[PDB]
Amino acid sequence: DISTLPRVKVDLVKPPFVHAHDQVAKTGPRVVEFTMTIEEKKLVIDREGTEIHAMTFNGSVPGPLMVVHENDYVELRLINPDTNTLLHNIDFHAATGALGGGALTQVNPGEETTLRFKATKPGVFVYHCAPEGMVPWHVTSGMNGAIMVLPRDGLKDEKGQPLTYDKIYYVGEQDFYVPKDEAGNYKKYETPGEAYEDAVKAMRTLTPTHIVFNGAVGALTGDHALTAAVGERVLVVHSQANRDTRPHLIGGHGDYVWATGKFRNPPDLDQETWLIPGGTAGAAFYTFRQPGVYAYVNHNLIEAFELGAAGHFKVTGEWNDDLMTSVVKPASM
Amino acid sequence: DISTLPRVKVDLVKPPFVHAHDQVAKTGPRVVEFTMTIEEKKLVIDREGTEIHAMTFNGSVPGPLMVVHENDYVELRLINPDTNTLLHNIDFHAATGALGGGALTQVNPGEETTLRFKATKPGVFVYHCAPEGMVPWHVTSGMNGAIMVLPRDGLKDEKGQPLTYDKIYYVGEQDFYVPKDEAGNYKKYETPGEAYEDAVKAMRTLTPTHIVFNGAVGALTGDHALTAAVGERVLVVHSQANRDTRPHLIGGHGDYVWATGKFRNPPDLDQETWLIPGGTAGAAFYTFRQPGVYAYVNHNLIEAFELGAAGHFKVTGEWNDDLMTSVVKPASM
Amino acid sequence: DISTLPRVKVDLVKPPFVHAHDQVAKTGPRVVEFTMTIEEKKLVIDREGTEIHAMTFNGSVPGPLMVVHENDYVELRLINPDTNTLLHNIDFHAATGALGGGALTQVNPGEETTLRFKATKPGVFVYHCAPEGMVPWHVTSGMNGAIMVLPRDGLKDEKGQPLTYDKIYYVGEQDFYVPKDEAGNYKKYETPGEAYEDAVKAMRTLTPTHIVFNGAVGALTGDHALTAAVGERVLVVHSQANRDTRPHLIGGHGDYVWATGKFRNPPDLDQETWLIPGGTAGAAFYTFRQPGVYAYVNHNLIEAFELGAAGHFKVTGEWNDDLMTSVVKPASM
Ligand SMILES: O=N[O-]
Ligand SMILES: O=N[O-]
Ligand SMILES: O=N[O-]
Ligand SMILES: [Cu+2]
Ligand SMILES: [Cu+2]
Ligand SMILES: [Cu+2]
Ligand SMILES: [Cu+2]
Ligand SMILES: [Cu+2]
Ligand SMILES: [Cu+2]
């Protein structure tokens, strides 16, 4: 009986960071309350200044990672302010019934709604907008995120022993399909509604114009590179709501990978590259062993280095020459 | 010695339905006799009235699901009537030797042949036409199906306990490559032979014009929606003979999934979305827990909702508010 | 302390053959020395005489398979002769740190370098060139190979029992993106540097013009078909450095498959087709049971039979009618 359960309000954070949570549950089942505000806005997605009308949960692409435990109840208040122009909803792949909540959450501009569902299956799962007749348009305009449902006793390895992460990051990868004129130049529009027919034509080519992490080319580089120290155990959650991807840590591995993201399955070990199907969230666990810069990419290297699907880690600590060393530096011969 | 084995004649049914069979074998090994008649015909594949010359086993796209047990013998009589125009054959991925039977089954119009093979490996497997020099053309014109080889003691979960399905459906997903004129309009032809050179050009773009379940856009909707009741255990067999797909039940899960379709492997649990590689059949087991409409899609959502890869389930029974409920219905605020 | 370890010099062989090695290690850990010479050269890749400027390790596409054991040290001397025009390096997905060795191996024409790394994870792994700013161009011009790191006690099945192969072949699959003029004819260039801007445009379509095994259409056919005898256990290593593939043995199976190529995981059994993600090497084990011709393909059949991703096995021995037989040969009805 849900009225006797504890309620807890969580304030979400912007990706690639993740709100505070316990790996091993320190309470019994709870009702976990989240609020998300839909925001349609202009977004500059590349170094050339290409602009789209993005459709976001909570102002970001991707939307923020929600974290609960198995058999918690998720209660989401979804707000569509009247500064928006479109009807939106939300589908949780984590949930059972009513098109993942999509049938119960249709909100016009000026409306709100509150949905509750029980998190019966552990794993990372995609959530995305899915309004009838306009599903791929909303999703490929950035309206997707993920939710992690941890087992109550946390993550386990292939032998059933505990795996504890020191840091967690969320990487949302987004395929965009920006419309082009006859010559190949990107088109610009005053409103999202304007772009609609051109967007359908662009999607139907099945060829994205950009593929990005965290909403833009170069978003997870420089000042915004992911950080870690040698010896730290890092969990990287990665989602793609529409299209296959194949993540890879350049200079590293996935020590433990749930490529299709469901924790009741044992992880795959020692992965170089793993396939996350479109419409799925996956998770990879790695212990850093060397300092320096690492790139984290989609290993279709055209998608990575030409279309934008590349981010960086900056890792501090001590170099281990046993693992790798330059015996003779590049020289004439 | 095969002459002392029981023979049983099976009459095939049209997909998405599956002929009657026992999960757990009630007899020893048998010779299972099937007959299939090749039919080239015109097919209307979308709501706009686009027509192709389909190449079918038994008049349907996909061809019908055949069901046997491990170490049964399959004996297929394949008939190519003289109303057809092309040479056809059959390749079973279930079989060992002679290009899956392809080298032994080449039939001109007016010919027939009978092939026998032993079903030595359990799983769901693709079968498809594969005539020398024209393999992708026949396959992408609809000439493919699947065969299920059940273990003699039926399906088992990841712990080795029995999994029994109440209903089974077969979803054949088909990529078509309809040729286009300069402006983007679909071309029409009087005979299959006419389309050949244009078809090669269309295939080489690697970009399907349509992707459909059961031979047409909207085929598994409305009156032809798949049905189930809350509490029923449903097995969905899904094949794609040429191109990757990523099925997903909107509002549900794959409780037990054999994504690459081979039952000696333990299933993957609690899948949201799973990848079936091109040239493979997969299978997903689900117990319905909520009533209502569910969509079953390829979760590249452009492929689903723009190109045609979407079907429906209509599920009857009682709503369970513990799993999901609307706490505050959409309203102003 | 590495100076007390045995050193062994290995001479590499051209794919699809693999240098001599022991499955089960007959020595303790060693430093295994390899030398590779970079060669930029013209390559004819199809039956029409289309030419590209290939960038190769050791003169071949793919580069040669290197074979070591877990916890051996790999010492690679990489030579870039001054007859080349470009800067090259090497990234081993097998290695830990410095972008897989990429940051430590940048060699201009006229330079050499020697890298050492410890092979801490067992599996097959891709290696590829990855120079800063030009990663996909070098990779999709053929500059990739694989390295196998065997467990010290060799391969094991899903029950932990030994699997011993009689033959091993390496199939490198390569996506090429040859630039086209307005009409669709392939362009020719005097130097690699000439093609650069046209190549970027071609890659950005995400649509390969050719997909080949061992560097050319038809390379593994005829005189160059792979061979085996009925009863032999064959390991096929397959890599794709940039793009997904889905291998399939026509008339056979993958009895034991490590689709993502990492031997600490149990194999998948009885696969018809398996997905190797771009940026991965996989391995399939099969025991031949029937003689004759088999085709080994990427089972996107357009990619196989139109774009080039098809090779042959020629298998000798005795036909087994229990497994398959023609009951009634094709005849009028
Ligand atoms: O090793 N990364 O492309
Ligand atoms: O949740 N289906 O797109
Ligand atoms: O059965 N091979 O396409
Ligand atoms: Cu929306
Ligand atoms: Cu979805
Ligand atoms: Cu045919
Ligand atoms: Cu096939
Ligand atoms: Cu290079
Ligand atoms: Cu790489």
Residue numbers in the entry:
A (entry chain A), B (entry chain A), C (entry chain A): 8 to 340
Please give the exact wording used by the authors of the publication that reports this structure:
We describe the approach with a detailed case study of MSS experiments on microcrystals of copper nitrite reductase from Achromobacter cycloclastes (AcNiR). Here, we describe the development of a modified MSOX approach applied to microcrystals at RT. This approach is no longer multiple structures from one crystal, but multiple serial structures from many crystals (MSS). We also describe a practical approach to separating polymorphs within a population of microcrystals and obtaining separate structures of each form, leading to two separate MSS series collected from a single batch of crystals.
A total of 20 successive images of 20 ms exposure each were measured at each aperture position of a chip, providing 20 room-temperature data sets at different dose points. Indexing of individual diffraction patterns (stills) from the first image measured from each AcNiR microcrystal revealed a bimodal distribution of unit-cell parameters. As a consequence, images were binned into two groups above and below a mid-peak cutoff of 97.25 Å, which we henceforth refer to as AcNiR-big (a = b = c = 97.75 Å) and AcNiR-small (a = b = c = 96.38 Å). Separation of the unit-cell polymorphs led to an improvement in data quality, suggesting that this analysis step is beneficial over simply merging all data regardless of unit-cell parameter. Refinement of the structure arising from each polymorph revealed two different structures, as shown in Fig. 4. The AcNiR-big and AcNiR-small structures were superimposable with an r.m.s.d. of 0.16 Å. The subsequent fall in diffracting power follows an exponential decay, with a somewhat faster fall-off with dose for the AcNiR-small population than the AcNiR-big population. The half-doses for the two polymorphs were 55 and 75 kGy, respectively. The AcNiR-small population rapidly decreases, with a concomitant increase in the population of AcNiR-big. The resulting decrease in multiplicity significantly impacts the resolution to which acceptable merging statistics are obtained. While not conclusive, this could suggest that expansion of the small cell acts as a trigger or seed leading to subsequent polymorph swapping.
